[PDB]
Design a binder for this molecule. Sequence first.
Ligand SMILES: O=C(O)CCCC[C@@H]1SC[C@@H]2NC(=O)N[C@@H]21
Length: 305
Amino acid sequence: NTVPLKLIALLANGEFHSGEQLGETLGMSRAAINKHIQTLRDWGVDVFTVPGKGYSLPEPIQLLNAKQILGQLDGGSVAVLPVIDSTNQYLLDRIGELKSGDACIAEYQQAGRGRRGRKWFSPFGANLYLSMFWRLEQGPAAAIGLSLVIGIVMAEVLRKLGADKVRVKWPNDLYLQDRKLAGILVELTGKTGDAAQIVIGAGINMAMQGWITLQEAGINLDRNTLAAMLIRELRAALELFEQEGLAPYLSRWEKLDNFINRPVKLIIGDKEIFGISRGIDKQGALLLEQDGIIKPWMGGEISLR
Ligand SMILES: O=C(O)CCCC[C@@H]1SC[C@@H]2NC(=O)N[C@@H]21
């Protein structure tokens, strides 16, 4: 899967390359070069061909840079995949060579997946596809605020890099102009009386419904920075979490919650609760008030009313 990665690696500028310059550099035929080209077209890559001359990218992409990323971070263990099934799987598939905070990003995911068996959609270098491994001592017991924590953090990072208006949805997504901007998939394995092993996936809509991307709201952030900022502050919070639970969030959450003090709809399976958000409880529980009556709920999905 090399060559592709090389090609792509040079077309990245958004300029013209004749199959001529490419093949010599690559030390291969124009002929060979056209096959790789296909592979590319396949990764969501939009290659513009001009028959016997050369190739071009409609748009210039910015690839991930291990080193750039590695660079910062402070003490970091990151895997930078270019191509893979899915960032979550990769780690799930390897829970025991892993340690807390281990991460990885890919340029493109062949089987990107969401919550409730939904396809994620992960074209080469258009966005941010990331996952982080974390282990919890008490075990399966937690997670809940773990995820609140994650969304919270992400909102902060975004907010600080530009995108000043990003908010959070209880319990798993980022919002902007009320459309879904990022998606979060947390997956746990546990035992009774034994650590919970967590794999956390975050998907962020960068490049250009009900869904929204950073580019449409006109925000144009650096990928590598983004990346690196994320991992660093999550490592930081997952600890803090590890050490305290929600205690430290709560107020954080309230100021970023997109639906607080608004009409919504909560459902576990097919069961519909209707009313007003009063936030979250000390247990990452949703607060729902129905007729001057506030109550806690740890499940279902939240849409608006
Ligand atoms: O909206 C959802 O249902 C959550 C989507 C989470 C997608 C991200 S992309 C990186 C990580 N690995 C995956 O395959 N999924 C998460």
